[PDB]
Amino acid sequence: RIRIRLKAFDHRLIDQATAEIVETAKRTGAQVRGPIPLPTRKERFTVLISPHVNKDARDQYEIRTHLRLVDIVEPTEKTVDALMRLDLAAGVDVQISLG
Amino acid sequence: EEFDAIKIALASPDMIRSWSFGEVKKPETINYRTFKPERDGLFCARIFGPVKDYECLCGKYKRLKHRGVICEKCGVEVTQTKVRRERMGHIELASPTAHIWFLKSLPSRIGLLLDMPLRDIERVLYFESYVVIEGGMTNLERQQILTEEQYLDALEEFGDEFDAKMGAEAIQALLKSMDLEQECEQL
Amino acid sequence: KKRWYVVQAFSGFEGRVATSLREHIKLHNMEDLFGEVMVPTEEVVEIRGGQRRKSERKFFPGYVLVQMVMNDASWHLVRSVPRVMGFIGGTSDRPAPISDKEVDAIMNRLQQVGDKPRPKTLFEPGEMVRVNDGPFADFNGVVEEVDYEKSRLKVSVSIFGRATPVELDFSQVEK
Amino acid sequence: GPEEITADIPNVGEAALSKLDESGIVYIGAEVTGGDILVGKVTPKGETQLTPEEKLLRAIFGEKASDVKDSSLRVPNGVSGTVIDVQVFTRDGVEKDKRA
Amino acid sequence: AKQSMKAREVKRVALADKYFAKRAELKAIISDVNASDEDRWNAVLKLQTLPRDSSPSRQRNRCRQTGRPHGFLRKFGLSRIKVREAAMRGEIPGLKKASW
Amino acid sequence: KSDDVNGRTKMYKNIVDGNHQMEPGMPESFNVLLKEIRSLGINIELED
Amino acid sequence: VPLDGGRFATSDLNDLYRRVINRNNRLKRLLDLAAPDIIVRNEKRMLQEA
């Protein structure tokens, strides 16, 4: 089975990507597993915002890396190849893995 | 272009290699999944060229300011499909092979070149006799055709320096060891 | 003493020719005039393999080996076996046995069928591998990774962009 | 993919499609000329350069044809006539359309 | 930071890049309990001989824009001050002010 | 009118521009004859 | 040529070249694995006749 790991910072974008991938899968092949949402990584950062000194002065940023696990149960001839030409939107790191 | 003569002659194997752009090695023609041909059978792409104009099999070059560079994936020179009308390929035969037009055209050119009748040449070229090459200081001649028992005789008594072969290799050794100056002077 | 001879059959019906030949022997009961019948051996599938299944093994290109003697009755017997063209020899009067000096070296090679062999091979990323098994069959790609410790060449089927990266066995894909 | 016999056909207008029904096949009785359309038939093309609109149009209708390549049957150039009888044969499993 | 400091850092990095294979090997040799004493000694001495800037524990992580040694972040390669600026500008992808 | 493909496209441009003139060239089926004779052991050419 | 039926009734030349390449590849494999000489004589006869 083809496991697909979508990773992105924007959630909407990721969602869009996932849908597209599903569409790509579903026309060619059959029995797409589904878009399973894994836990989001909220990598936080604190920094001092003064140039020199004021320690209680701080900004707390974060990067929300979202995960989408799409799986394809039956890899056909037509389906797997379809993704080669079918590149997804920018800012979405995909990671296909058969078996 | 411009020309005033059409010359016809025989073709050396180096000439057939120099016409040829590749070598056919397999007998498949089309994939019949798609109609993209099989490498490198009869219908090919890396021997004979692209099916579609400037349309590389793998697809990577399709610019007007990007012409001349060849492909790297399928290695198909993105050119025109008219070149599949003019590129030729070659087959390397594993054993040599007698051409039929010089064997059975009545008269036989291999026949009245070797000073040898056509029945002996047909019984040698189809692997059912033995002709002699490099007979040595024995009882046997040069153009003497043999049979199975006589080759058993000649390999029991003269398994050394005597030699004889059969098939197209033997005819090729006869035709290669032919000295034309001696035959001109002797005739 | 029974010497060997070569029989030509319609290539593809060779096992059925061998079975019909054994049956014609046990019909016309010249049992003292036939020793064996040797057909499609020396299997190797394609490349290497240490498991079962696989199959698609064939070396015999259409010739049937027969331990025999030569009487004209047994010659008519073998050519009256159906789907048999004839013997292959110097002549059709007295057809030809093969050899015996090349049987000693062939015996040592047949005894080493499975004891200590299977030479190693190699590969590299270029230009692209070929897939002929699973849904990825009929597709080509490149091997970005080649695990020699797990014997698994990572090939994404050589497609522009991030398509479908996957793992295929050496026999599962062709160079 | 397979072909389409339906009358949603590219590159044509009212003047061709007035003599077809809502499912491609010409009427019984429509007196045609040399070079009209009797059966409308379009084969798959492809996305190739799937642009923002092309990708948005490949996820709004859920169909991938899209523009298609006209291969409709036409009256061969020269003959008039009047369509008197239409037969439609369907290999079993395929969806019968409204005229079948 | 100064230009000079930056230059020094760069040099150190270069040295590290150069001498990694050898240094690592030496370290391994020194570690290896199943080895000769004399050999070990030699290795230890050999290490000393190699340049100091070849060590990776010599090089300080500075900001890639300003070269500021302190307040550094690894993910961005930038000092806090610059990182913040980047965030404000939209230049770091995904990064926005966090509240919970 | 029959065989030469570059000759007939030059002809069609020349007819729709009013210049009745032909650029002759070679029949392409004669090149097919060269490829069929050349695909034997025979070496046919075009001299000069 | 396609006959518009999913199959290709091939021209005679591709059949002939396919027969020569089948017989030649089988003769290369039989000269490879040291076949007995009667069988490679028969195989060369078949190649000459093809």
UniProtKB/Swiss-Prot annotation, chain D:
It comes from Escherichia coli O157:H7. This is DNA-directed RNA polymerase subunit beta. Signal peptide: none annotated. Belongs to the RNA polymerase beta chain family. It comes from the Bacteria. The chain holds residues 846 to 945 of 1342 of the full protein. The RNAP catalytic core consists of 2 alpha, 1 beta, 1 beta' and 1 omega subunit. When a sigma factor is associated with the core the holoenzyme is formed, which can initiate transcription. DNA-dependent RNA polymerase catalyzes the transcription of DNA into RNA using the four ribonucleoside triphosphates as substrates.
